[PDB]
Amino acid sequence: KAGSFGDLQSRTSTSNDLYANTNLKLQRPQAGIVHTPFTQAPSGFERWK
Amino acid sequence: KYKTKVPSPVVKCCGATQCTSKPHPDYQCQVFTGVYPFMWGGAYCFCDT
Amino acid sequence: YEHTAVMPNKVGIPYKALVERPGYAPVHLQIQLVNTRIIPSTNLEYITCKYKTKVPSPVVKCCGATQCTSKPHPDYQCQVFTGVYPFMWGGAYCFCDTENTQMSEAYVERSEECSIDHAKAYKVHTGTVQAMVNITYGSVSWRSADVYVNGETPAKIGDAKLIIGPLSSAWSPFDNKVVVYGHEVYNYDFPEYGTGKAGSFGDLQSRTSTSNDLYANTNLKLQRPQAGIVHTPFTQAPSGFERWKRDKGAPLNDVAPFGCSIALEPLRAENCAVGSIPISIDIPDAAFTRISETPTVSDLECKITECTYASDFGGIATVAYKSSKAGNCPIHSPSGVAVIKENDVTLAESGSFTFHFSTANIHPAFKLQVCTSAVTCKGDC
Amino acid sequence: YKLARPYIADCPNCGHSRCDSPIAIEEVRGDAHAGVIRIQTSAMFGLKTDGVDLAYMSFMNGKTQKSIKIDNLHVRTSAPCSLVSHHGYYILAQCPPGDTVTVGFHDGPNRHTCTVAHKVEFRPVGREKYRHPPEHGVELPCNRYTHKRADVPFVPVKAKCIATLAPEPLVEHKHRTLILHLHPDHPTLLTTRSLGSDANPTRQWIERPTTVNFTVTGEGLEYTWGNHPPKRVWAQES
Amino acid sequence: PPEHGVELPCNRYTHKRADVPFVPVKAKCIATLAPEPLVEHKHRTL
Amino acid sequence: YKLARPYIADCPNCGHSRCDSPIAIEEVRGDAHAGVIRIQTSAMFGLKTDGVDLAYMSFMNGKTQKSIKIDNLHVRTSAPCSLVSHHGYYILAQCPPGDTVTVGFHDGPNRHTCTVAHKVEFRPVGREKYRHPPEHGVELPCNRYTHKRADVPFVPVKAKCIATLAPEPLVEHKHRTLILHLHPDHPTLLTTRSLGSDANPTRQWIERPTTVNFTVTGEGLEYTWGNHPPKRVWAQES
């Protein structure tokens, strides 16, 4: 779910069939710094908490 | 909680970059052209356009 | 032949109308008011920016005193301060921690860094309103003509003599006194030039980016230190601009009841959407259809196949006809609850021509015209 | 030019029993509509024998004096701040408020730190604050400073500013209604009004996924989300 | 206490060595001032 | 054991425009109800010139590869923070927030400092905070990393740390009534429920001295106050 519970999914603490839908939205690069610019929706577990 | 993993961005200096999809959980890419002016934030490429 | 049609102020929807005269084919006429710019006359009252406090250095007498001597600066303030150093508070301080007296002088100037970083106090008087009106007459859609929304100057242009009768595409969201931040303009009132205080915009004034017309009322209050001394400390009221920043209005760019994109360096209102715009178009007769399809067009039916509720150009419809010979006769929308995407309609005897239309209503009722015959199309959006 | 020297200036609280101290920042300029600061410090940062350097400073006092390479002397707000260029008497750095700078040296006879926080208030010409224009989101014209070395002061430069916006501005069209399902990653100012006769002048800052419905004329609507100049949709299903 | 604003009563200590001991006393402590308070007089109403 | 090396790595915030720093915190673990942090730096801690200490590190800052005493290298969030143990690539320290770590050099020439705002957090697994030891209540599990080497990573292991149990839990039983006289110092979650065939399901967050009365039918009730697993009274005034 996008920005809600189970936006990261697994079936154990460590990696195990990692399926996500964290709603990653890349942002357009602009002048001031160079990195990899993106925003993303809040973690679904944290959102759930 | 997720940990965001950022693979180092594929930058093509003086040509276009075409995204190569990867099967990572919520892998999203976007290709942005004419990214940086250089020397006012950085570009690190001869070309800017 | 002048033909007056009314285009809804929907930037991006061309309003199709027919220039109709019986015994003459209708003319493709599309009027789009593409943009309207309300450009008002701006009388600069003052430039205002962050002040820079100038302390020349206070005259300190260790075990003596000095009385204030006035000096001409915009908010020159002095105070004579005794003590300087509290008793038993220093390690190579002045012996006198009482007798020692400093004449504390300071003043404000404009900052050196107000070079481009300044806000602007503007009195605003009545403007002119320009409208960029893209007009198609026949198949010549390649002319677009500025015409004033205001009555000041009707377009005497060769493209088509255009009058845009005044409407809500003309106005001025710019009050008598307007603050310009430098990208976002806010209606905010303040005392007229030579006056400004904390509780309104401006209280440091200039009239150019740096210097010129230096008037201050920054409420400079000299103070004394608790330890050390190289330059006297002070409290002050913030600049009226700085105060204004802590007491912002709402930027006109993001709010404006007419749906106009207020844009700034000169304050102006770009791209209104309010109301519907009378456009009087003097049609150039060389693009006028006038039995230029010699067919009489007969046996028409209009069926609207699909439409999606009040959409950009979500209307899909089909025209049946018989024409003496195939041609193009222009379709239109004398309605405003539907506008046609196409202003041209393919005369054929097939019984189907699929044409596209646009709506702003959940029912598409427009009158479609071929060269001699008129029909109405209806469906469901 | 690069004729600046190290000297003392009055500080509100600095080390020793007198605050006629080293490393004391006389004036600060926040005369930008970015987030950048031109600093005027009595003690000189940014110069060794090289001329314009990035990593040496000098200071003097009478009680707690010496010069050092910048190392034991850390600039802070409470976190690092990076200088870019020095033009003698003027220092230029990217630091978040651009009015509050705390410089202190943790070596020498005492441990002196001066803080300057005296006003020269500013915010961007938009409605979101930056510490320096980021990559993310829309650009806005603004004032800032010169950041290239060329030595006198780093005078204001009309040059781009950038405001971050949030990830997904999911607009949902209906008949005469636009609900904006918004999904903040960071506090975004959403200002709206409908375009046309109807208008919805509603400023609100939002954080965390929410919906906000507005009426629409049928002639469009504007929503700016995360500090923009109008992002607007016109007559359609708006 | 900064160095800008009105001095008002406070507790404090002596700030230079007497070599007598540092013990509580009252001294003066700076506290922030504010801009001009614009008063407007009217009849039976201020 | 230690299979680590001191080296530069990119940190987006440094004391100068020189950002060729080491001490760049690759990873942090802070998933505990403690205050301690396992830090993974690009610089090697637990190796100085002479090798293994508990209070020296080594680094290359692209201008000097040397080791220093944790004195010249101070961790801070603003105030100093003292390391406890070193395990090669990993540091283990006490630095209370443990999600904001700024490692910086008061060494020799140039001031490289990395600051990290890592994604790990300290959190309760309960319904009310105990994420960091308070003085209130009595202990609940936490994670405190090993203070001796035990694989390059310091292993996370369970340990005991202070936990919130709500201040002043004065219970008063009465006829058919359970008043809970509360006098917190801080936001405490009061949850109650009956344990019998009576109901009373009441969640509330409370602050300040308050009372909260519950029905009793002679069939018990549980009240947990300020994060507890069930505390229960039965078959009377409960």
Q: Is A34 on the interface with F (CB under 8 A)?
A: no
Measured from the Cβ of residue C44, the count of other Cβ atoms closer than 10 Å reads 13
Q: Is the dihedral angle over the CA atoms F38, F41, F45, F51 positive or is it negative?
A: positive
In one-letter notation, the amino acid at residue F95 is C
CB F55 within 8 A of CB F93: no
CB C317 within 8 A of CB C354: yes
Solved how? Answer: cryo-EM
What is chain A's length?
49
Measured from the Cβ of residue D81, the count of other Cβ atoms closer than 10 Å reads 23
HSE (CB half, 13 Å, CA atoms) of F162? 9
CB C96 within 8 A of CB C123: no
H-run or E-run covering C162: strand C162-164
H helix runs in D50-196, sequence order = none
Give Cα separations from D207 to A41, D182, D211 (angstroms): 11, 9, 11
**DSSP bridge partners of C347:** C327
CA dist B33 and A29 (Å) reads 9
In one-letter notation, the amino acid at residue C352 is S
Nearest to F37 by CA among F101, F109, F103, F115: F101
3-state secondary structure D145-166: CCCCCCCCCCCCCEEEEECCCC
Q: Tokens for F52, please give them.
A: 């293994």
**DSSP bridge partners of D193:** D222
Give Cα separations from C292 to C329, C330, C350, F118 (angstroms): 9, 12, 21, 75
Q: Is B32 on the interface with D (CB under 8 A)?
A: no
Residues 6+ apart with CB under 8 A from B23: none
Residue E14 burial (10 A CB sphere; 0-12, 13-18, 19+): middle
H-run or E-run covering E30: strand E25-31
Which positions in chain D touch E3 (Cβ < 8 Å)?
Answer: 10, 12, 19
CA dist D89 and D94 (Å) reads 17
Please report, in angstroms and rounded to a whole number, the separation of the first and last CA atoms in chain B.
39
CA dist C217 and C238 (Å) reads 10
D162, D164, D206: best mutation site toward chain A, by most A Cβ within 10 Å? D162
CA dist C222 and C216 (Å) reads 16
DSSP string covering C32-68: EEEEEEEEEEEEEEEEE--EEEE----EEETTS----
Q: Is D237 on the interface with E (CB under 8 A)?
A: no
CB C265 within 8 A of CB D143: no
Residue in D closest to A30 by C-alpha: D135
CA dist D214 and D203 (Å) reads 12
Q: Tokens for E30, please give them.
A: 């700076």
Q: Is the dihedral angle over the CA atoms C210, C212, C218, C222 positive or is it negative?
A: positive
Q: Is B27 helix (H, G, I), strand (E, B) or coil?
A: coil
CB F40 within 8 A of CB F26: yes
Which positions in chain B touch A25 (Cβ < 8 Å)?
Answer: 28
Q: Give the Cα-Cα-Cα angle F152, F158, F163 (nearest 5 degrees).
A: 135
- Sheet with D210-215: strands ordered across: D168-173, D177-183, D210-215
Q: Is C328 on the interface with E (CB under 8 A)?
A: no
Residue C170 burial (10 A CB sphere; 0-12, 13-18, 19+): buried
Across D45-70, b (16+ Cβ under 10 Å) vs e yields bbbbeeeebbbbbbbbbebbeebbbb
H helix runs in chain C, sequence order = 240-245
| Nearest Cβ partner for D80 among F15, F106, F109 | F15
Residue in B closest to F28 by C-alpha: B3
CA dist C360 and C10 (Å) reads 10
CB A7 within 8 A of CB A1: yes
CA dist C311 and F61 (Å) reads 61
Residue with the two structure tokens 């004033």:
C148
Q: Give the Cα-Cα-Cα angle C354, C358, C363 (nearest 5 degrees).
A: 95
Longest dimension (CA), chain E: 63
Q: Is the dihedral angle over the CA atoms C182, C188, C192, C194 positive or is it negative?
A: negative
Nearest to F196 by CA among F137, F236, F156: F236
Q: Supply the DSSP symbol for C286.
A: G
CA dist D166 and D189 (Å) reads 10
Resolution in A: 14.1
Longest dimension (CA), chain D: 76
3-state secondary structure chain F: CCCCCCCCCCCCCCCCCCCCCCCCEEEEECCCCCCEEEEEEEEEECCECCECCCCEEEEECCCCEEEEECCCEEEECCCEEEEEEEEEEEEEEECCCCCEEEEEECCCCCCCEEEEECCCCCCCCCCCCCCCCCCCCCCEEEECCCCCCCCCCCCCCEEEECCCCCCCCEEEEECCEEEEEECCCCCEEEEEEECCCCCCCEEEEECCCEEEEEECCCCCEEEEECCCCCCEECCCCC
CB D10 within 8 A of CB C233: yes
Nearest to F61 by CA among F25, F10, F101, F100: F10
CA dist C359 and C65 (Å) reads 84
Return contacts of F65-72, CB within 8 angstroms, 24+ apart: F65/F6, F66/F107, F66/F108, F68/F105, F68/F107, F72/F105, F72/F106, F72/F107
Residue with the two structure tokens 């003496």:
C324
CA dist E30 and B2 (Å) reads 49
HSE (CB half, 13 Å, CA atoms) of C365? 1
Give Cα separations from E23 to C91, C155, E20, E26, F138 (angstroms): 19, 88, 9, 10, 39
CB A32 within 8 A of CB B41: yes
Task: Decide: F and C in contact? Rule: 3+ Cβ pairs under 8 Å.
Answer: no
Q: Is C225 on the interface with E (CB under 8 A)?
A: yes
